[PDB]
Amino acid sequence: GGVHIEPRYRQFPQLTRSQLIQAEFFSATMWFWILWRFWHDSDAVLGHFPYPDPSQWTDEELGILPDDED
Template sequence: MVATRLVPLLRTAVLPSLRRGLHTSSSRSSGAVWTYRTAPAAPSKTVTRRAEIVSSIMWWWILYHFMTDYEHITGEFAYPDPSLWTDEELGIPPDDED
């Protein structure tokens, strides 16, 4: 008798609410506003301002280190002068060798 009254109760009250609340995947548009053949909405001023601040800090960091730690790009040691190299160091045989 309890089972005969419990099954309709589960069908009408509990199961639809469980189906509504269970989602195993996110929505297709990921919560963003859907636009089709129109330009997307412009970002807010705070987002634009934050992006400019972050990019300014990034470029300051890059340019500052180009000026102060330029050895990362040019190398740590002075480039040797090729005019001071001998023929033996370059692997050139002497002129009198036949």
Template sequence: MLVSRGAGPLRCIFTKLNQSNLRQGTQPIRKGHDAVWTYRQPVPPPPKYVRVLAECVGGYMWWWIFWHLWHEPEHITGEFEYPDPSKWTDEELGIPPDDEE
């Protein structure tokens, strides 16, 4: 009974050993993660839906920027009017009077 149960695993072990002896000195072939290897070749273009999605997202981004620049320019220019520096006095600027030593 034990011999009949062990025949399958023994056969599997012997076939693996014979296959490894045949392939001695060769490097195993590795095909992992469906990676596209592009050695000295141009990268393959992305699928059409990726290009369309990228264009849509980029268009939405620029619409968002220009919309807010047009309707809320204070984010860039500031909320208040810039003061005229020619109207500032020496005292406001912290400059001492000329006759003081």
């Protein structure tokens, strides 16, 4: 199916340039996709809507009377 590559016996195996170029291309493609999506849609990771502080809400908007009315 492929090309002929002979055994090497205690040395680094013979490497075709095609496999190197494809592996590098796919790794770079994944990293580019991650960067592109982070740039375009970062609120899926960091969040978009603020989380409110329950203690910051005053008794006026929360319906609390000064402990004597009711």
